[PDB]
Design a protein around this ligand. Structure first.
Ligand SMILES: Nc1ncnc2c1ncn2[C@@H]1O[C@H](COP(=O)(O)OP(=O)(O)NP(=O)(O)O)[C@@H](O)[C@H]1O
Ligand SMILES: Nc1ncnc2c1ncn2[C@@H]1O[C@H](COP(=O)(O)OP(=O)(O)NP(=O)(O)O)[C@@H](O)[C@H]1O
Ligand SMILES: [Mg+2]
Ligand SMILES: [Mg+2]
Lengths: 463, 463
């Protein structure tokens, strides 16, 4: 017997309550998986689901005490945990799940299988998710004005589209992108459009995650990034002025891993799942404490070169090398965006771009040619090679050059290498990094008399 | 006769609820010892073990109030504590225990004897724990790519295999291992493979456990590594920048200890059992504040020297001496590893290596010669010998060599020692270390004090 135990068993047989690996219960209400840390929603689920039970059972669930008894039975019933958020190509809305590969929208038992514990926070509309509309035409004009379709902007616009499209995938991304451009160029407009499109999957944090350490004490700025599809940081503190802390390369490397280590206040959970595209919006180039290949593998840059100005400053801005086009500023555009006018138009654009750029594998690739800091470390790699075994027999002309054969390897001493490099670089501006490279790759081959085991490709190229 | 007291006694007779020396109740549900400080599982167990009881006793357990009464009876019954996690060669799975010495898998009462309060978190498949498989061929190819089977890499690969297989032991490990290499060499791939293989017996922490003081206040980052069999802190912040604290030698010595002192938020337990093997993957060699013989006994290094590159960067990779072999990157490997494809193939490989390298006592040995910092102190020991009475009958020819005598002890003056060491050292970089050596071994003799009672091996051999 025990009517209430029978009710709890019947409710548990529908798989509407689940226990997660973080020790919180997720309930299936209103075509969505919901959970709350301080107020569980099990009684909410019971009261909502009373309509699916026999008449003799439904009238019992109208009493809070009996609902609490059923909740206790269910809590005792749930023993084992389940894994959630395992499908990267599904976009969850408050009333269903959108398939990014097919385009089909699922609700009910079809959307139940994909245990997505996050959502955009608003309902999906099949009527406004169309390709042709005045909203779509306005949005296409705005996008084409922000990033023109000229041949000199093709790769940059493709990178723009790829970065914006990746904000739909629930997986780990391997690059950090920089939206760089001068004032009034559409960067914050793009950010607000994306926020309107993807809703609660979009989060904004501070420069602390880039500048300070991440373990330290409690860090809600890192703890809030759990399972978010897009993270935005803004207003990079230009480091030309003194007192500014440089960006940490280890922070960049840790923000790429699939698990980020950090904890909130009054909590012991120290591991967060990383599903986010991290975008930094700035008008100044970034500088890092140290530069290496690992850092150079994880940075991409998108440029904004269109200025929207009043007629007062049109002539002044038309004589600036920082802009490739000047347009007329729109006054009501920010309010129109705030009213979620282009939400579904931009969603349709994002899904189309996702299909376009998502061949069987979609990956983010770096652009190290856009950062002035990497210039020396790129030119050095273009001018020198490491002395391998395959250069031993040719040591005659190399000894004419100045190379010496020690320990059966060809090497180059201090001063000769210094002047050979100074012939290729500038001593006034490229000094500190030259000394840093010399100290980094220095090797004392014998007792004193240090040397580098590096050969210029020009010496072998031109005998 | 108090049916509920009889039920509580009958449940206690089956030995399914135990009290631990940490003051927590562990229950045996679904072939596993489980506990949760926030939500006790005693009522879950009471509901679970109800078909074993007689028919009249079973029906009484369908009420939460009666289950709570039985739980109160059990809590009053349990007075004495027991010891858990004692067997080091048993691997606990969610549905049993794998015997590492024999390979047998025990389920039920056979696995109940080993009070293993930790688990991998997933069930054990006997169909996938096989030698032949497409997954096994793919995994063998991947591992052979990451660590080549050449004789120039034989010892390094053996160290690799030993360190990985030591993650299955439930004992304490007295060595810290560094995974050192350049970018795109397979360190994170190895970390992800091990994480998928051993599941929940794996925690990733921050760099505070290496850089800061462990005691301080609360420290979840060190209270979370209790009975974990692998700790995988990552991305040291290239201490050569000098903008951050170096590694702490006392922190290393405390981490190679059977118990670690550290307290989480709330709670009152400050000692944590150390079953973990700590691995750190970095692009830079470690540097420590103080170097001594106690530190050199607890550090080993595995080096990664295979590059996985794009075709556009293949040539620049082939021209680098930091790599020994360049191969083509695979796009889908990250997703395949994330999908737990090689979960049991790697487990079989690890058990095979465990049986291989577990000569009845398995220990982790250090590799000091792999650390550039230890070079000075290492080859000082091959040059200098502490003075002893057996070197007394050489004073005449030693004075011809320049050695002085003081109270029947051979001694060399400060300037003489400096100028004789100058034959074996340079000045620019070794000055700090030579001053450190002189001041640390500065005894009292000759001119009042400040003389060194050491003898060079060269002058020992030469009469
Ligand atoms: N396509 C467009 N056509 C006309 N006006 C536009 C268009 N896009 C944006 N605007 C307007 O131009 C303004 C430019 O501001 P904003 O979008 O913030 O550029 P910004 O790069 O963020 N400036 P800043 O952040 O200081 O570097 C917007 O606030 C709009 O009012
Ligand atoms: N055997 C393999 N064959 C082909 N590709 C591989 C293989 N093993 C790993 N890869 C891929 O090659 C890349 C190497 O990355 P990763 O494993 O992170 O090396 P890494 O040393 O951690 N890079 P870094 O952290 O910057 O030093 C990844 O995209 C892997 O998926
Ligand atoms: Mg802005
Ligand atoms: Mg890595």
């Amino acid at each position: 017997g025990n009517k209430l135990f029978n009710i709890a068993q019947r409710i548990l047989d529908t798989n509407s309550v689940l226990l997660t690996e973080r020790g919180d219960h997720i309930v299936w209400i209103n075509n969505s998986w919901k959970f709350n840390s301080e107020e569980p929603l099990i009684t909410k689920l019971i009261l909502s689901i009373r309509h699916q039970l026999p008449k003799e059972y439904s009238s019992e669930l109208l009493c809070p005490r009996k609902r609490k008894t059923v909740e206790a039975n269910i809590r005792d019933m749930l023993v084992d945990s389940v894994e959630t958020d395992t499908y990267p190509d599904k976009l969850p809305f408050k009333n269903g799940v959108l398939d990014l590969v097919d385009g089909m929208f699922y609700s009910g038992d079809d959307a139940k299988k994909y245990t997505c514990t996050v959502s955009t926070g608003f309902k999906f509309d099949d009527t406004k998710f169309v390709e042709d509309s005045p909203e779509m035409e306005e949005l296409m004009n705005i996008i084409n004005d922000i990033q023109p379709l000229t041949d000199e902007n093709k790769k940059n616009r493709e990178l723009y589209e790829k970065t914006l499209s990746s904000c739909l995938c629930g997986a780990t991304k391997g690059c950090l992108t920089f939206f760089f451009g001068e004032t009034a160029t559409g960067k914050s407009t793009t950010k607000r459009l994306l926020k309107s499109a993807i809703g609660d999957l979009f989060v904004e944090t501070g420069q602390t995650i880039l500048t300070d350490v991440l373990d330290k004490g409690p860090n809600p700025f890192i703890a809030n990034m759990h399972l978010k599809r897009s993270v935005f940081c803004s207003e990079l503190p230009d480091f030309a002025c003194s007192g500014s802390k440089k960006i940490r390369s280890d922070n960049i490397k840790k923000l790429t891993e699939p698990c980020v280590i950090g904890r909130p206040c009054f909590s012991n959970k120290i591991n967060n799942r990383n599903h986010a595209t991290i975008i930094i919006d700035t008008n100044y180039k970034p500088v890092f404490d140290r530069i290496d290949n690992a850092l150079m593998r994880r940075i991409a840059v998108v440029r904004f070169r269109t200025h929207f100005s009043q007629p007062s400053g049109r002539e002044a801005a038309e004589n600036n090398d920082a802009y490739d086009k000047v347009k007329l500023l729109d006054e009501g555009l920010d309010g129109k965006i705030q009213n979620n006018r282009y939400r579904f138009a931009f969603l349709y654009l994002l899904v189309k771009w996702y299909k376009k750029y998502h061949i069987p594998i979609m990956k983010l690739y770096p652009t190290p040619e856009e950062i002035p800091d990497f210039a020396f470390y790129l030119k050095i790699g273009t001018l020198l090679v490491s002395s391998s075994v395959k250069h031993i027999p040719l040591m005659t002309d190399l000894s004419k050059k100045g190379y010496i054969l020690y320990d059966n390897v060809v090497t180059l001493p201090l001063t000769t290498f210094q002047q050979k490099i100074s012939k290729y670089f500038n001593s006034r501006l490229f000094g500190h990094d030259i000394e840093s490279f010399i100290n980094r790759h220095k090797k004392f081959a014998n007792v004193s008399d240090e040397y580098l085991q590096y050969i210029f490709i020009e010496d072998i190229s031109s005998p």
